[PDB]
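Dear U.,

Please find below the material for section 3 of the report. The protein was modelled together with zinc ion; I have listed the sequence and SMILES used, followed by the predicted complex structure.
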Amino acid sequence: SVPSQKTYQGSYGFRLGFLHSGTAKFGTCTYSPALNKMFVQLAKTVPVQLYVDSTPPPGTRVRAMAIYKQSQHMTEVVRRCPHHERSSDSDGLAPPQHLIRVEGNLRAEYLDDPNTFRHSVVVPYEPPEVGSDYTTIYFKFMCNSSCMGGMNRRPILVIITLEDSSGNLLGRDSFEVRVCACPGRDRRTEEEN
Ligand SMILES: [Zn+2]
C-alpha cells in the first residue's frame, strides 16, 4: 500500500517552499529547484516552509513520511539502518528506527502505521509568525543515503501531507532527499544531468 505522492494543493492552497534557511548553517543543506531535491548532512537541521492561501481549521496536522523513489523499492519501508538503530543517542522521544525527526516542536508524534508498518512524524499545523507568509518546520534525517542495511544508496521522497484531526487528506506535496557528506557537491553533480 505505497503512499501516494500526488501533489494536491487542496482547498487551502497547500504547498512547500525552500527559500528560507532560517537557522540552518551554510554547508549543511541545499535545495535544487530543478530537481525538487533537498541535499542535507546527517543529523543536521533542515528548514522546510509550508505555505497556504488560507489558514486551515483547528486540529489540522502536518505529516512527514519517506518512501523509496524507485518503483522496485517502493513497497519497502524506509527505516534507520541496523548500525544507527542500535546507537544510543536518544532518550526515548524519537524512536531509533525513524529516519525523520522534527526539531524544536514539543508536540511531535512519532507514528508507526498499524497496517503498513511505515514510520512518520506529525506535528500540529501552526500559522506563520506575525509578518511572515510561511510556517517553518525543521527536520533532521538520521541516516545517510548510503547507509548499508538502510537506504543503501536508494533515493527517497519525503511526502508532506496536511490532514484534518481525523486523518483526512487536506493537501499534499513532496520533495526528493539525499543525506550526504557534502550537499553542495552532490547537488552540483546531479544537476549536471
Ligand atoms: Zn544509518
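For the text of the report, you could mention the following: Residues 80-81, 83-84, 143, 147, 150 surround zinc ion (CB under 6 Å).

Regards,
Y.
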